[PDB]
Structures are given as structure tokens and as C-alpha cells.
């Protein structure tokens, strides 16, 4: 896994092809490493297999990484990183 702090390089946005992408700047030691990601519905219930990107990696300290997700409709929460360093972003996807 990857245990360093993560931060947003560019806020999550919708893509031309019906996904969402967020750029995260890895600020920690131990790269390269797996970016911890987890998508939870409004009930904090892990929404499954909606990370379109191949298992995302941080390349080096202060390396930005594009992550593409297919969030569920309605409210969702994207937890990046692990522990108290973890980022929680909110996303709402409209039906159209």
C-alpha cells in the first residue's frame, strides 16, 4: 500500500466519457506505492469495482496521479489514502 499523505492537485471533475477523474499529489515517503482508494455510497457502504484506472500508483514524493472512477448515481464518497491522512471527497452524479 501507500501510507504517505495525499492532497488534491486538481479537484474531481466529470470526463467527456461519463467517468470522473481526480489528480492527487502524493506527499510522503515509500514511493512507488499503491494509492489506497475506496468508494462508499451514502450509507458509507463500499461501492465496488468502479475504479477505471489501472491500480493507481504514486511514482515518487510529490508525484501527481490521475485516478478515474465511475461513481454511482446520487451521493458518493471517495476516500483516498489511509488513516487520519485519508482524504474524503464528496461527489453527486446526476442521472444525465
Amino acid at each position, epitope marked *: 500500500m501507500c501510507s504517505g499523505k495525499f492532497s488534491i492537485d486538481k479537484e474531481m*471533475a466529470e*470526463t*467527456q*466519457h*461519463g*467517468t470522473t477523474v481526480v489528480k492527487v499529489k502524493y506527499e510522503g515517503a515509500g514511493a512507488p506505492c499503491k494509492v489506497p482508494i475506496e468508494i462508499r455510497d451514502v450509507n458509507k457502504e463500499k461501492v465496488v469495482g468502479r475504479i*477505471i484506472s489501472s491500480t493507481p500508483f504514486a511514482e515518487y514524493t510529490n508525484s501527481v496521479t*490521475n485516478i*478515474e472512477l*465511475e461513481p454511482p448515481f446520487g451521493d458518493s464518497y471517495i476516500v483516498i489514502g489511509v488513516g487520519d491522512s485519508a482524504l474524503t471527497l464528496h461527489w453527486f452524479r446526476k442521472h444525465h
Partner: antibody, heavy 117, light 114 residues
Framework: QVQLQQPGAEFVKPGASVKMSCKAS????????INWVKQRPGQGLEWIGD????????NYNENFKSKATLTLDTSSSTAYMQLSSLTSEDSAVYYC??????????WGQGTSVTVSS | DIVMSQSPSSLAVSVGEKVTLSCKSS????????????LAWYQQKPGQSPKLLIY???TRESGVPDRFTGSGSGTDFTLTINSVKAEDLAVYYC?????????FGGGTKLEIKR
């Protein structure tokens, strides 16, 4: 009808930059994405990046991250791309296209860039 | 990145003859959420900009004659032209939009046989 209008050609020296326009008409400009695509004379197509009119969202191919810049002018319904630190490798035709869900359903005629001293 | 491979690289076909072109993806282009294959075909006539023929693998763009048909799923796609016309000479490309960055196949040069 749907139309994308680009300048025919640009001639510039190495090390310099260039900016080219893509003027849209025939549809509501803020409802569609615009892509940019590179084609070397005898080669295929290469996606540079896209931009969404209105929100201003941009996405780049990592290959062109330090080379290309995508911008807009919503009033003139125009999109622009700038290429920097030019070399002969950048000599190519550059199309803009309208994107419908990832498909490029309309195209400009292309701007042919020659980089030479 | 995703890799789009097209074969043959070139072929010659007569007016009225049928022809099949292939496009394989290095990974699936299928969204299980809506069973949509994120793949498109384009026709680029000599000295002209590319033109969209099909999207989502099987869906014809408006204005395109029905003799152009898209087929396939997952990673194996094909574009068939039956009753090839003389004006159909061009380079046909496939493109994915499964994920950024979009990448195109090497293309297939369609020569006309007279």
C-alpha cells in the same frame, strides 16, 4: 450545420511557441467537449487532450503535458491550443474536433504546423 | 496506455465486394454498467479531416449509409463494408474512449480495385 474552423498553416522556428484557434458554429458550444488531435504527415492520429466549454475542465495526454496548453473563449465560441519549445517532432497537422461522449463526431480541417530553422 | 491494433494494415477490394477490418484492444473497452463498448470508427479520405462512422462499436452516426456496420465487444471489434463504393477509399481508424488518454489504432488503408 456543425462546423469547426481552423487556420490552414503555421510556420515557426524551433524553440518558439505557437497558438492556433478552433472556431465553432452550428450548435450550442457549451453542450459539447472539444478534443485536439495530432497527425504527423504519413502517420496516424494522436490525442492531445480535451476541454469542456463552460466548466473549463481540461485533460491532457501525459505525452503533451509539458508541450500543449488548452484554453477557451466562450464569447467567441472558440477554443485554442498552444505548443511550446517547438521542434521538428512537432511538425504536423493539428485537428480540433467536437466530442460526443468520447466519440469525435465532427472535425476541423486542421492546421499544418512546420517547425524549421 | 491502451493500445489499439488494426489489421490488415492495408487491403484492396472491388466495388460491390464485401470487406472486414479488425481492431483489437489491449484491454476490454466494455462498461459493464451499461454494456457499452467505448469504441468508434473513423474514415479519413485523402487530404481531408477524419469523419465519424460509428460509435459504441455498433451504432452508426447520422448520415452514414447502412452499408457500414460495426460489430464486436470486449476487445475484439470489426467494421464491415458491404458493396464497397468507389468513394470509400480512405484510411479507417478505430479509437477507444474507455479512459484518458484516448488512443487510435494504426489505421487500415482501404485501396479501391478497378
Amino acid at each position: 450545420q456543425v462546423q469547426l474552423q481552423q487556420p490552414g498553416a503555421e510556420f515557426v522556428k524551433p524553440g518558439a511557441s505557437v497558438k492556433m484557434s478552433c472556431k465553432a458554429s452550428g450548435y450550442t458550444f457549451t453542450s459539447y467537449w472539444i478534443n485536439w488531435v495530432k497527425q504527423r504527415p504519413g502517420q496516424g492520429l494522436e490525442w492531445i487532450g480535451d476541454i469542456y466549454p463552460g466548466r473549463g475542465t481540461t485533460n491532457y495526454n501525459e505525452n503533451f503535458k509539458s508541450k500543449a496548453t488548452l484554453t477557451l473563449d466562450t464569447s467567441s465560441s472558440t477554443a485554442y491550443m498552444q505548443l511550446s519549445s517547438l521542434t521538428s517532432e512537432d511538425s504536423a497537422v493539428y485537428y480540433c474536433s467536437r466530442g460526443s461522449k468520447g466519440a469525435m463526431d465532427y472535425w476541423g480541417q486542421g492546421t499544418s504546423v512546420t517547425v524549421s530553422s | 496506455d491502451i493500445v489499439m491494433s488494426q489489421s490488415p494494415s492495408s487491403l484492396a477490394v472491388s466495388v460491390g465486394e464485401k470487406v472486414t477490418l479488425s481492431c483489437k484492444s489491449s484491454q476490454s473497452l466494455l462498461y459493464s454498467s451499461n454494456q457499452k463498448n467505448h469504441l468508434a470508427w473513423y474514415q479519413q479520405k485523402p487530404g481531408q479531416s477524419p469523419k465519424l462512422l460509428i460509435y459504441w462499436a455498433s451504432t452508426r452516426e447520422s448520415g452514414v449509409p447502412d452499408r457500414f456496420t460495426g460489430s464486436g465487444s470486449g476487445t475484439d471489434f470489426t467494421l464491415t463494408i458491404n458493396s464497397v463504393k468507389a468513394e470509400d477509399l480512405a484510411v479507417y481508424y478505430c479509437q477507444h474512449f474507455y479512459i484518458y488518454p484516448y488512443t487510435f489504432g494504426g489505421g487500415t488503408k482501404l485501396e479501391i480495385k478497378r
